[PDB]
RNA sequence: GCUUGAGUCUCGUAGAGGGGGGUAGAAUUCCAGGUGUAGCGGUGAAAUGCGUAGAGAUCUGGAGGAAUACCGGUGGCGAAGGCGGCCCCCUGGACGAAGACUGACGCUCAGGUGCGAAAGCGUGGGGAGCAAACAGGAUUAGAUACCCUGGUAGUCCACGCC
RNA sequence: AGGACCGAACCGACUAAUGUCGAAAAAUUAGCGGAUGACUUGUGGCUGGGGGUGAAAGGCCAAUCAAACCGGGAGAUAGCU
RNA sequence: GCUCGCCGGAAGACCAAGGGUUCCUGUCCAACGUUAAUCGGGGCAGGGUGAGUCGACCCCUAAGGCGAGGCCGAAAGGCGUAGUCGAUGGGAAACAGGUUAAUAUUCCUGUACUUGGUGUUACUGCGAAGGGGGGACGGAGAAGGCUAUGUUGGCCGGGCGACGGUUGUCCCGGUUUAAGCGUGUAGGCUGGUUUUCCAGGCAAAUCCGGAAAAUCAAGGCUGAGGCGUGAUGACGAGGCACUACGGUGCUGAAGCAACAAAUGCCCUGCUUCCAGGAAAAGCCUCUAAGCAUCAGGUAACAUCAAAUCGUACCCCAAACCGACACAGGUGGUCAGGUAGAGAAUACCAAGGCGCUUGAGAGAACUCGGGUGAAGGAACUAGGCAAAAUGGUGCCGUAACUUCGGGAGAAGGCACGCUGAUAUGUAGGUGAGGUCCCUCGCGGAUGGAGCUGAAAUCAGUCGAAGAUACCAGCUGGCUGCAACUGUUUAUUAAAAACACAGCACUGUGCAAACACGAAAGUGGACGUAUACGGUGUGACGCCUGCCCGGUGCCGGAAGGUUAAU
RNA sequence: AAUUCCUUGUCGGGUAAGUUCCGACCUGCACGAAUGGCGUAAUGAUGGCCAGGCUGUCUCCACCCGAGACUCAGUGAAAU
RNA sequence: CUUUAAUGUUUGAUGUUCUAACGUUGACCCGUAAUCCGGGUUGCGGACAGUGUCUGGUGGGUAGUUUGACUGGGGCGGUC
RNA sequence: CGCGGGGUGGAGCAGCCUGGUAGCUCGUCGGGCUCAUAACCCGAAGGUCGUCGGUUCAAAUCCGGCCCCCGCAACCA
């Protein structure tokens, strides 16, 4: 059985990083609701 | 020419390759080479929107010369290679002036000729001309659709268009497909047939002959499912519909030409 | 060894002999247009079919494929089957003439090899006409026959096979 | 030469046993099929919800699929418990 | 610490990924560990990651993303040119030994290398977003030449060994050495040089290409390994000396030959076949716009710089992914002895572990297994499971056939050890000696040493000689499907799907059709021997009749016919 | 017959005994010619059937070796 | 009223031709080293094509939905 | 069990629907033809409309009971 998350950082900070949701207007509108709700980790970084 | 393989083993008991000993068996001509890409069958949007097609097998793209702009300078024919992105072959030919090019090798030439383009050439397979000078009756390929466009017709293996009438301005092409259809006097085109004749002779033998090729599996329409497509469904193989393509558009009879800017051209349909 | 067997060389004669590449004429079918009008086609009689959506007849033009009127004759050629519009090219065989030459190399020939009408088969093209099979209309006691209107394979070409 | 054969690493998953509050939210063991190809694998991208993808089973899309997950319509509505 | 057992192409040793101090030392046991715990990957405090040569950043691009303008779209936004990013790709450069409680191709010692700047001396024309060469490439197969490595021998050191023997053909340990430079070999590729001309290379060209000639026959490019050197250096078994008794300091002999041989290297070769196998830059080279007492370039030398980041530890697992210290999953490299075809397998070497609950009893019963008289499928839905067959060489082998097969059909014979042919044959490798020379990594000849199948004969041992692990059950008839392959991840692997082939039909290219409100793409930088849809499904013989119903195509005279 | 309801059709072969199997006759409830038909060498982790071989599958189980089960110490659940 | 003929006039249905709208996924140049695009020459089609509005037709490709109740369980038959 | 249809000279089929009169072909009989047969020609006979009963001026016909035949249905656990 292969489980289903295999850690590759980089493919994780392309597709769900801050700069890839700063680049479009729906990852702003979501940046956004992150502010709204006072959460600390805003996006996924080291 | 063509050649059978042996029985010798399940997948080798049914090809039929067809072999050409006058092929340049060397490398390809390195100066007219550039990256040809697969798309696999998607366009822009990444969706496959033509399907049965992807995998295969990388292949290389060859500036090949339609237009032969060039004019009244000699060449010589220096070796025929196998195109792998045609299904006829491609001469590797030389002007007298030292520019290499590639040109739709035709029927009748051989490693060592010579031919030449414009209105000064004589009749000859392999030489450029406008078909305001060219006999009506002959046999070309390779026929331009607007002035200096460079070439569209009839291009693969075998294919040969014939001039039935010169009505001034307006030549008429008796296409291949039995089509009836007239074409401005000032396009070019080139004298003879498309080489590799026997293309057509040969058989595929296996399945993946196919697949490397460039294909992928075809499903039939009764083996799907009502929400995959029109057909499917039942519980044993029930058909009982007008076949249709996976979009509802009724098949297997139904004209779909719909150009209508075009239809001044075509004189005769195809029967 | 000789020469009357047989074979060869020199010069000519006649021919649908065989093969490949082009060209020409009449006619047929279809397509397009004009003139023009109630029949056209067919037979023993008729009917199916075609026709006022305007046919057939007629004229003009074009696209095509197949076979070559008269010459043509129990005439010719080739071993046979078989082959005829004409032309170019390659080329086989037969006969005659006045001589020379090799010097019996000859005859037949199971097995064997090759060619071998049409029909038929396979791969790939072309497809006018004709036409198995087949449908329809008549004949008929019955007609899955003879006849008529349509009509596919095939008939034609290239490469193999039988 | 071979979608060639026997057969390890690798991939796949036909038979039985064990397991089923398991060691494991489909595994292990003893035998298996393929095994130079339509093979397999790593890294990195692209296609997404009435759509994508599919050698087509209505299978797969983060353990959920004859229409995913999260928030909002919305305290949907219920002659029913 | 003394024994035993286990893996040993891994349960060993190193990397990428991914985690994130878990690594090491001291100390502590309440909480974590399925038991106790002075123990540990657990708490607490401290220490450790040292780079011009490793990787990343950098230069340059592929798939693809962003995208000035631009086209298009209610808006959001979509597409896309020039450019700009993006490796798993290509491009400069280091190895050996030693040292720590923990890191080291990074630190020290020894010996080298690479990319640029500044300055100096002597020469000389340099110079792009531009041209060319190069970089630059596929699958598969076989041979030759070597190396890592291993064995034997020589040699050196030690021992002669607690029950019979062992100064001898005895036993054990060691016998290691790079990067770079020089030589430029086995092998591979290819005819050089020179004169002249040109519609060729968006412009130019002395460079490439092409076209005529002369001269001479080789020159040149590339290239593992070997031999020297690197190195009278280091290492090195064993002694000698101090013990906080863990180890440190000191000293230090032999260091060669032969044979076997890789899946590694030469090989990013050569042959052959086909499905016909990146781009750009670094580098090399030629010029335009221009600049010339310059500037720049070639060569040598001196000096300076080579910055930033990661570097610990785990990395086939108690540290990653599975909620767990979970019998699962995880790509790449190195990879020995004997037997064996082999990375199978068996037992071991190096190395690392005994799986973090055990002590007793030996009941029924359950699972993993051993054996079984007599019969041998009577079991049962059914030969399901076990059992048995099982290797090599050779003998031999049917119906049918698409003439490939079927087939390893079936059924059989010989397999151990010793001697002899032969103080180890055929064969392979190959030094010394002799000789020649276009003198070197050369070629003939020569044959010692070394190594080593297999065949035959004879003899002998056990019940059994492929003795274990490992390792086909086979024959007959017949349904479906041609066969390989694919699929219901996690109850269905099949007769289902795909398949090549065939048939029908649409499309003349701004092609048909599909995605998308549009542009723009795919189709295809292909064009009827092509592409889209459908049906069937190798191959052989075939594939009959019907145009009423539905659909489709063709023709449109008539009736009817929306908006206007 | 992957098709046949009636049906375990009837006949012959195979067994001591054959609702399956194999070969045929045609009464085809309701096969059929690309929703392709009838055959087919080879191939198949395929369906049905027979024979040899081989055995604990069975007649009928019998003994032994280990892991649990039982007792003792430490730890310590679950469904309900 | 029917049948009709010359002219004037009114628009309509077709045919041929031209070039200015427009198309141009033909050749060439510039912006610009850029196969996008825009503009400018030229050639080819041509008032078609194509687009917006109105409208007839085809239309499970697509969407929202309907498909009764009684019934000695339901279905079917029958009834209302 | 339920639903639809059918039963007509010797035979195969119309007519029922919407009631008063039953038709087509083959077969048969007598004659003609031919030497004889078939075929062909001429003319004619032949039917309780399954059975019984009711409704009606009148029943093959409208309806119902029963008999025989054909098709459909006899299903979901």
Known sequence: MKRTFQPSVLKRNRSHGFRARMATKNGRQVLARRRAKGRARLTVSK | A??????????????????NPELHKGKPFAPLLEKNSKSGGRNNNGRITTRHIGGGHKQA????????????????????EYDPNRSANIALVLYKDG???YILAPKGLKAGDQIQSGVDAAIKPGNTLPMRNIPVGSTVHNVEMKPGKGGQLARSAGTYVQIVARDGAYVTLR??????????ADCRATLGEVGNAEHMLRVLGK??????????????????????????????????????????????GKKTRSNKRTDKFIVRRRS
């Not at chain 2, 793209?61 to 025929?80: C, Q, S, T």
């Open chain 2, 2 to 19: 063509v050649v059978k393989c042996k029985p010798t083993s399940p997948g080798r008991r049914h090809v039929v390759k067809v072999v």
């Open chain 2, 99 to 101: 520019e290499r090019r």
């Open chain 2, 207 to 252: 399945a993946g002959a196919a697949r490397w090729r460039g294909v992928r599996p075809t499903v039939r329409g009764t083996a799907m499912n009502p929400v995959d497509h029109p057909h499917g469904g039942g519980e044993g193989r029930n058909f009982g519909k007008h076949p249709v393509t996976p979009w509802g558009v009724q098949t297997k």
């Open chain 2, 175 to 184: 296409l291949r497909s039995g089509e009836m259809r007239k074409v401005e």
């Open chain 2, 61 to 80: 793209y060859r500036i090949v010369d339609f237009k032969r702009n060039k004019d009244g300078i000699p060449a010589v024919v220096e070796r025929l």
